[PDB]
Design a protein around this ligand. Structure first.
Ligand code: MG
Ligand code: MG
Ligand code: MG
Ligand code: MG
Ligand code: MG
Ligand code: MG
Ligand code: MG
Lengths: 51, 248, 118, 229
RNA sequence: GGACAUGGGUUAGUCGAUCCUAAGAGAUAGGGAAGCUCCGUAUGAAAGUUGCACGAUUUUUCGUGCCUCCUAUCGAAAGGGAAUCCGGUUAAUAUUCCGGAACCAGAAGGUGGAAUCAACACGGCAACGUAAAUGAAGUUGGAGACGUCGGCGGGAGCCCUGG
RNA sequence: GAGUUCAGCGCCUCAUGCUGAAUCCGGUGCGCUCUCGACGGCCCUUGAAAAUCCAACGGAAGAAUGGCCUUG
RNA sequence: GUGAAGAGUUUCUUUACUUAAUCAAUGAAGCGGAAUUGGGAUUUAUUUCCCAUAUUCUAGCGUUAAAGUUUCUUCGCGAACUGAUCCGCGUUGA
């Protein structure tokens, strides 16, 4: 649609029922979740091995 | 006579054509993080800049004092890629793309977009394929000696920052343009400086070289350094002329 | 005196409203363009007559500065009828003409006769 | 209770958004504030000629309180007090003698720069109090030399504004005591002796010493570091 | 007769302008200049419209508050851009009038429905789906938003063809 | 029910009214004009901006309760 | 303007300062100095001769404070300290 036509749709037509729905693709979100988890776990081990 | 072409290049139709340019290529304002530590940024885009040989890199940094992200426009060094992490500051590692004080890098390192004054955000070695070489440090009253692309040796303070690596965009000038039209397109996105009419092709009113019943200059084309505008044409303050056979 | 921003901004101060010692103008002006200025005259050309008897609409010469809001009120106050829509045009002689359509519960022909331009 | 867990923030370089600290030192101030601050600095550098440097040497707190205690006793009459005196003179000027018969000689501090200068030149000032912050300083820069020449005790005291309060004005460049009631003669003499030991006795040697000339801040610490090594 | 004379004639929320910014123009700060004026456009300026309810009965936008990188305006009837179609009608207007059938934007909240018994719905492995499916500040992302040539595939109107 | 085509009736006719039929079924493309879709080539040329609209991350704030007639 | 050496009652060269003046940056965003700190040489040791940092990860996220004692009296996203050491004659650099 043209940009202002989006102001007339209902909420769910402008998004997907998922995190970052309507802003990130499904595969991009999946990369973000896995990347966030693995990086956080690495921060945990680096903190554990620092002591 | 009339005002010669060189004297008319003071603005107006001779301004740079800058509509298609996305931003100046600058180092990043020298701040606390870079003075004392490092800060990490991620390469978001590597883009063509109309009128510039080298590509530019848009690099995203976190703002240390506010919840916001600051995008910087760097001259891309060869090897840089989107998604790469770059590190700027005193404690950044000596890796292609990182930004370090020249005093923190050993003699012989190859760098680009080097500051003349600490914090001027990049002056030296910026065009495609160019770089600056670290020659030596003088720790007492810290001054770093560098070699410039022209071959000149320069002394910058050992706090002026530099980017590790050579400016991307390679050996652009190795390719013959081959056609007037290709030169047309190269300068169309730069400024109104092409094509160029020769001075001797003109009339005396137009140029000191103009006139005569053959196309010739008349007097010497090596003119003094202190010539007035309108007579400062040809080979200005030339130390020598002619085809050099072995130089340094 | 803690400043958490590196930017000095002008502090907010009282800013009193005007309390004049004298009214600059002694007498307020009466309403300019009330209703006798807005409606100048009925228009009774042949085309206007057809508008009256076919589309239930009246044609008026009105003030150049009248709009569709004030023309509606003026017609209601002067002739006690309720326009449903008003269309406006500025004629090539520079004067403004209004097409005032009346509701289906009023007859434009009767209103025209009552005004007296028929 | 178990849900209340500490969540520390590091605040090192590149870790957490810095907390809201005091940035007053690095604020870009409006021009008038900048001017009045760098003006105080420039007066600290820029070695000060002795006739200007003798100011900024003011009376101590204790002597200043005694002086103002005496001055506050001899305040000039206010407009209300003056109006009351005039109605008394008017009532007594109808059936009795002149206004002298019903009003007494006034005892009050003298003020007004031209008036006080004349009193000093005529040797009628017993004590002269010179404000310390007269902004065009030339108005009073000669007063210590004039007082010393005429042998009248003088003190440089803080706040032209404090002097002005005594005489019911916003500010006063200088005040003079000409006469004091008998009950205050000993206090004036003690103040005069205290003032003289600090100022009149100083004047001979104060004419040579220069003010300012001091750098401070970072440059002095560098000198201190230079000395320590 | 486009001449001459007398009259008549141009109807809009949806078409333009109006709004936006472009090259550019240009007040202001400030500095030049005898001056007409010249330079300058967050510029060396105390350049604040916006974000919070602490008072406030009581069911709500007026007082201080502590706040934060905001900003003049002009500049496109071919750039960007909310929304209208058919049939009819006049001597002469029509996406503007008439008949019929729509659409957009804003305001208030007029009904109905939905979720919530403690909290803001379910389905699908998933891509994702639905009549609705609470979301302040702040931030980030997207659309607006973009060259040119070449052939290939579809659609619409036109063209051609059989009754 | 509009539009089009055709055939009749009143016949000074008037508001120019009234009454009948048809407007159906097939095919075609290196065609034309526009357009969309997926692509390919080219550049030391890589081909506006802003208004405006939308989405997300975030979690501010809310007050229904007497197993039900009761609010946001 | 302010200070230091040198030259046969004086002003000439260089070798120092910054507050005048000039340049550049920025949202004038962390400058300078102390105190705690741990290797250190002094050394039957005393920070006395020495300055020590927190983010390298892979295209994530990072804001509107948690915790900590503890004061109203502990009805409260309630007030303060703190978390975020102290101090200042300089926004920073040349
Ligand atoms: Mg010729
Ligand atoms: Mg000539
Ligand atoms: Mg109109
Ligand atoms: Mg005519
Ligand atoms: Mg339109
Ligand atoms: Mg405009
Ligand atoms: Mg026409």
């Amino acid at each position: 649609l043209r940009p202002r036509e989006f102001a007339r749709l209902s909420h769910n037509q402008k998004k997907v029922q998922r995190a970052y729905g309507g802003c990130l693709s499904a595969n991009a979100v999946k990369d973000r979740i896995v990347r966030a988890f693995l990086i956080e776990e690495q921060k945990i081990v680096k903190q554990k091995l620092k002591q | 006579g009339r005002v010669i072409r060189a004297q008319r290049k003071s603005g107006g139709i001779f301004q740079a054509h800058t509509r298609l340019r996305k931003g100046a290529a600058q180092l990043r304002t020298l701040d606390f993080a870079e003075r004392h530590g490092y800060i990490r940024g991620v390469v978001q885009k590597i883009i063509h800049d109309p009128g510039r040989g080298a590509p530019l890199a848009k690099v995203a940094f976190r703002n240390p004092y506010h919840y916001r992200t600051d995008v910087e426009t760097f001259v891309a060094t060869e090897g840089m890629y989107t998604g790469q992490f770059v590190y700027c500051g005193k404690n950044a590692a000596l890796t292609v793309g990182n930004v370090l004080p020249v005093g923190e890098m050993p003699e012989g390192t190859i760098i680009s977009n080097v500051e003349e004054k600490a914090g001027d955000r990049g002056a030296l070695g910026r065009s495609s394929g160019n770089y600056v070489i670290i020659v030596g440090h003088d720790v007492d009253t810290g001054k770093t000696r560098v070699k410039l692309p022209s071959g000149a040796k320069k002394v910058v303070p050992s706090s002026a920052r530099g980017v590790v690596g050579i400016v991307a965009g390679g050996g652009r000038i190795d390719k013959p343009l081959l056609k007037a039209g290709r030169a047309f397109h190269k300068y169309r996105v730069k400024r109104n400086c092409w094509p160029r009419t020769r001075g001797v092709a003109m009339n005396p009113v137009d140029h000191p070289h103009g006139g005569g019943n053959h196309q010739h200059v008349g007097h010497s084309t090596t003119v003094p350094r202190q010539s007035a505008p309108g007579q400062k044409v040809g080979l200005i303050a030339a130390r020598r002329t002619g085809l050099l056979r072995g130089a340094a | 005196k803690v400043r958490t921003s590196t930017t000095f901004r002008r502090p907010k101060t009282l800013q009193l409203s005007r309390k004049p010692k004298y009214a600059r103008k002694s007498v307020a002006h009466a309403p300019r363009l009330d209703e006798y200025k807005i409606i100048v005259n009925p228009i009774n050309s042949e085309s206007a007559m057809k508008k009256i008897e076919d589309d239930n609409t009246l044609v008026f010469h009105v003030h150049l500065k009248a709009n569709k809001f004030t023309i509606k009120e003026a017609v209601r106050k002067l002739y006690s009828v309720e326009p449903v829509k008003i269309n406006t045009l500025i004629r090539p002689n520079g004067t403004k003409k209004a097409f005032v359509k009346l509701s289906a519960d009023a007859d434009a022909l009767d209103v025209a006769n009552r005004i007296g331009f028929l | 209770n178990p849900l209340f867990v500490s969540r520390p923030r590091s605040f090192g370089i590149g870790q957490d958004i810095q907390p809201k600290r005091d940035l007053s030192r690095f604020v870009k101030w409006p021009e008038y504030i900048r001017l009045q601050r760098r003006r105080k600095i420039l007066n600290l550098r820029l070695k000060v000629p002795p006739a200007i440097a003798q100011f900024q040497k003011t009376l101590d707190k204790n002597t200043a309180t005694q002086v103002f205690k005496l001055l506050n006793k001899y305040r000039p009459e206010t407009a209300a007090e003056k109006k009351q005196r005039l109605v008394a003179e008017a009532e007594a000027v109808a059936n009795g003698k002149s206004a002298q018969d019903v009003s007494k000689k006034p005892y009050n501090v003298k003020y007004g720069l031209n008036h006080v200068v004349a009193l000093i030149e005529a040797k009628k000032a017993k004590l002269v109090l010179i404000a310390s912050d007269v902004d065009p300083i030339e108005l009073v820069v000669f007063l210590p030399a004039l007082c010393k020449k005429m042998g009248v005790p003088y003190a440089i005291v803080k706040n032209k504004a404090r002097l002005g309060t005594v005489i019911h004005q916003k500010t006063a460049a200088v005040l003079a005591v000409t006469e004091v009631r008998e009950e205050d003669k000993n206090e004036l003499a003690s103040i005069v002796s205290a003032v003289d030991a600090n100022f009149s006795a100083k004047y001979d040697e104060s004419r040579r010493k220069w003010g300012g000339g001091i750098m401070g801040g970072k440059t002095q610490a560098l000198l201190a570091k230079r000395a320590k090594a």
